[model samples]
Target chain A: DEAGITGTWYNQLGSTFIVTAGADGALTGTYESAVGNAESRYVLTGRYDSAPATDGSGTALGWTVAWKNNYRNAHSATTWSGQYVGGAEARINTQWLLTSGTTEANAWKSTLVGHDTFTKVK
Target chain B: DEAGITGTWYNQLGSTFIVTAGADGALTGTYESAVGNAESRYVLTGRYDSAPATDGSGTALGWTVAWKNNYRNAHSATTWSGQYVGGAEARINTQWLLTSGTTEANAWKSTLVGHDTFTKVK
Candidate 1:
């Protein structure tokens, strides 16, 4: 059941995501950042691969958030690729990438990639 | 100014994408469909390469909308790759792909690809 993902989740940096999985496994969420522009709210979208076991295992989840800014001639976005594991104390292991839009092909500093583990808040 | 893209854009299929480019070239919008559930509004993200000309040419653009579904063992996403061209009657030429998430490696029928040209509404 999607009841497995019914709370707020946070990463190592304190960024948080509030989500609800639809009965059919559809995901709609709001992502809040703790580091930059903490007051900003972003639209989040993605998917879950399977249902949750009481132990919260067997589900592979992926999600993304588009960067919102008024920077003319520019753009940015982030994607999360991860899986759900653990039992009653559920957790997610994720690797994420933030891409910056640029006209420069293969420009340095155009992307940020990192690993973050998320745990459900009590 | 980002005013070059301040309206609703429709693909050849009657699908519409409502968008506004941030002064810095950022993007935020909603996507509506004619092919599936009509009431669904998806979170859209992406970037633009350059400024909007009165003619709207010279800008390379790209954006994405993730698929929302409860299909267990499933996930899907779509990215629109295109360019802005045309003058006062600005328009876009795009190629998009819808990807299905699956455990099956390179599963057949895992994706749909299509082409469409979008024009700014009067």
Candidate 2:
């Protein structure tokens, strides 16, 4: 359900999200990052599955935040894709892939990959 | 420091808080409770230690939320008092005591006590 993705959440790295689920599974919110940016809160956009029920859990969550117009670090952006799990405490566990730059050759250093569990805040 | 307490946090019970610590140690925020209240986010008020360095950790956090006009349970309230611990991951570990009623006289059931660890969200 959209209720699974409609709340605030945070990762262990201290990045925070205040997400809102709109009509037709459209999602938008504010992203306050602890790294790769200043104290600035950026814009976030994503999607959720509003179908009849496909995944059993039925809610697939995905979001992306562009690191633009902030303190310089990586001029790229990060995309998070994951699913929603419900229980006594609902959680949106996601894995993110960030594209740092196109010039860097090293696979490990050029691109970044990390996983984080986001718990409900509101 | 106000930076230690100014952020979004959530407990294991899934209750969420978006607190803002003001000057002179005064604090206020929106409390989104997972129980004993509705889906509505209520007002929260409390204080923090604004001294130069009082506790080494230096930040004493306390807040209270009254369940006055909710969906109706006990018409009571809860107060959380705790400190801020800094490390790789900063945390606010708090224990809350709730007063349910004046009619119930049993010491064990009359008052409720519980502890929760709230992690950083923003």
Candidate 3:
């Protein structure tokens, strides 16, 4: 499950990678954006509250919410962190908002897409 | 390791695949013989006691054993799973020997392959 999530995150966001339940279940990961205009790449690490509350009769979760971007400081930075919800999925979506840097954070967000699931490997 | 394991397992066994640390950690996986006329594929998943006791091991671990295939569930079925052993290496090896099916499962076990490691991108 962790690996699948990790792969999915990497494929979707690139450079960003994840750590498994390491010693003490210490969950950690990194976010990196393609080196661009010496600006920080706003990143948001979030999870579905429950496979994403969605209406089968409605369009998939539709909303691109940007995060606060700090200084790209070399084009890579770590932003989000908290008690990782167990059994919850991990993802790093990006936007132009400034969540940490001295730049005017953008108000753009990523499209709220549908939740993707993977069969956990025991 | 789980993702790499899954990738490796699939790459090695071709169609055979495994699950990740699931809800019950009830390690489970499937082995498919490419549906070639209907022959069950053999699979085995085990873990290392400690990152594979390697002494620069005189050519790594040597000896691949075939699993006992109960029967080809129409060319697809599950195999090998205990407790995931917390953390260990999982692999599936093929051989010719009747474990449950009628055909000689084949003794030609896969070569005792070396363990390939991967870096957890955190």
Candidate 4:
């Protein structure tokens, strides 16, 4: 049932995510951005809960993900509100902010307007 | 010259990389596997140097990457030997090993045999 979201996903921008769902409806995964280098890379761990329906259509699922980026000497956080649109596609709207870190201080707070589609690979 | 590899790259398996070249021929970036969730995700930071040519052709570039995965308390490492193939494409052979941590103890040491092609996006 929840296996729809349990796989690797990527956007056209090349950002990638590896996600899995637990028996308790808890979601877990990792996220890597398409930008930055080793010293400035964005690697995050995410946690979320899955709901049966997000849209009034009652056929799709809604999930909200809270992520913490731990890039060893870096700290940042992100939130993803998304819905599984069936098939191998999903749409996620994101907000990223710096919780603590000396890197990318000026670019700490940012948001992804609207939703971005992700295609599952496996 | 080095800009050829300064973008996001991904494999058919959904593994992704975000690479950047420094002024000193240093390569830096992040790598995320196509498997694992946030709690058990594989996120690595890579550092390496790029050489002018790897093949006898003396046209393509070769680089060896050393990576460290820091997912909260998890510790692992990986190495990638890769070359740019031209026009938004590259190939990499990888080896990954676990350095420390209580997670995935038995499956710590692993390798990706031969070379895998990666396509660059933006």
Best by DockQ: 1
Q: What is the TM-score of chain B alone in each candidate?
A: 0.79, 0.82, 0.31, 0.56
Residue-level lDDT of model 2, residues B96-122, one tens digit each, is 555433321232243355667788753
Tell me the DockQ of each model, to 2 decimals.
0.09, 0.01, 0.01, 0.02
Ranking by DockQ: 1, 4, 2, 3
Give all TM-scores, in the order shown: 0.50, 0.45, 0.22, 0.35
- Candidate 4 ranges beyond 4 A from true positions: A37-51, A54-72, A88-115, B1-122
Give lDDT tens digits, candidate 4, residues A35-114: 43323233322322333323321111222222222333222222332334444344332222211111122322222222
Score chain B of candidate 1 by TM-score: 0.79
> Candidate 1, A60: how far from true, in Å?
1.0
Candidate 3 per-residue C-alpha lDDT over B1-122 given as tens digits, one digit per residue, 9 for 90 to 100: 23323332342324444333222111224434442333464433222111211222110011111222454222111112111111244332211111111111221221121211221111
Provide the DockQ value for model 4: 0.02
Model 1: per-residue Cα lDDT over B87-110, one tens digit each: 676676655555454333343444
- Top candidate, metric lDDT: 1
Model with the higher TM-score, candidate 1 or 3:
1
DockQ score of candidate 2?
0.01
Maximum-TM-score candidate: 1
Q: TM-score: which is higher, 3 or 4?
A: 4
Query: Please, what are the lDDT tens digits per residue for candidate 3 over residues A1-122?
Result: 23323332342323333333222112223334433334343322222111211221100110111221344222111212111112344332211111111111221121111222122221
Cα lDDT of model 1 by residue, A1-122, tens digit: 37766668998888998888766545667777776533456656555544433331335555656545332222445666555555676776665555454333343344565667789863
